[PDB]
Design a protein around this ligand. Structure first.
Ligand SMILES: Nc1ccc(C(=O)N[C@H]2CCC(=O)NC2=O)c(F)c1
Ligand SMILES: O=C1CC[C@H](N2C(=O)c3ccccc3C2=O)C(=O)N1
Ligand SMILES: O=C1CC[C@H](N2C(=O)c3ccccc3C2=O)C(=O)N1
Ligand SMILES: [Zn+2]
Ligand SMILES: [Zn+2]
Ligand SMILES: [Zn+2]
Lengths: 84, 108, 104
């Protein structure tokens, strides 16, 4: 029952276990339904050698995590998990 | 005189659980999940609960918590679906996952 | 969006001022007489009248005292004000079903 990951606020589909905790952050190789905003930043990056960009939910605008450059680092408590 | 000590069924007032019995499963008492019908639930985990009626036999299908089987938990007074009872697992063997917005919190 | 008193329309609070106390802006609560309320927390509000001295008895929010909040314009009981805490020192718990949300 924890195969698909979704925006907690509106339910937009974001990623899946096939693409997949370290706040607790989940790293995914691929994601959908986000909007990546702004230019990359290195400041306080949790992953050595990566810059990040803010990742919002494309449906409701909730801040779900970051895109790193590649992979996506998403905040566990901003997501809902459920079955495929 | 604490005003946030007891959880009762929002629909009828049945005594269900207590703040003192919240349980941080995987490091957090709160879990946000969805079922196969796409319903999103803000689930609070409790070590203990009362005043429920646990319906049928456990199932592992679609379980949100690795290693646990679930049974539907209704309010034993009014039949409101308040969450699930989990069993069959490890550390703990059992717990309750209750739907936060279906409870009312208040004084003892 | 703004929240207006459902009974008379006076502006009371704003969506920008929603406050997630204990991790959620919504709290379903019951008082000692067993009345159930669905309360939304806001940092600020306007147009209310707070009645009585603050009380700590049965506060729904640990570390805060409460005062009853009426609409100042029509008298509707819209919720409570909370004070005497830290981070934040004060906020409101307003009864969702007694407000109307709409454009400013
Ligand atoms: N005989 C009564 C009737 C009502 C109340 C009442 O509504 N109290 C609220 C105040 C707000 C709060 O944070 N907690 C409460 O429980 C009461 F205390 C005593
Ligand atoms: O790799 C990252 C992503 C960004 C993240 N981060 C935050 O969580 C945060 C909160 C407030 C202001 C600025 C930041 C920031 O850089 C952080 O600490 N590291
Ligand atoms: O851990 C659990 C509890 C039960 C829950 N569940 C539901 O809420 C549901 C609704 C309809 C068909 C099947 C299911 C199911 O397994 C679910 O998805 N996971
Ligand atoms: Zn969203
Ligand atoms: Zn009930
Ligand atoms: Zn009014």
């Amino acid at each position: 029952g924890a195969s698909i990951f979704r925006c907690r606020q509106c339910g937009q589909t974001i990623s899946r276990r096939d693409w997949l905790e370290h706040f607790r952050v989940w790293c995914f190789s691929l994601a959908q339904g986000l909007r990546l905003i702004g230019a990359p930043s290195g400041e306080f990056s949790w992953f050595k050698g990566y810059d990040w960009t803010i990742a919002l939910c494309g449906q409701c605008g909730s801040h779900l995590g970051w895109h790193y450059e590649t992979f996506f680092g998403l905040i566990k408590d901003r997501l809902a998990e459920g079955p495929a």
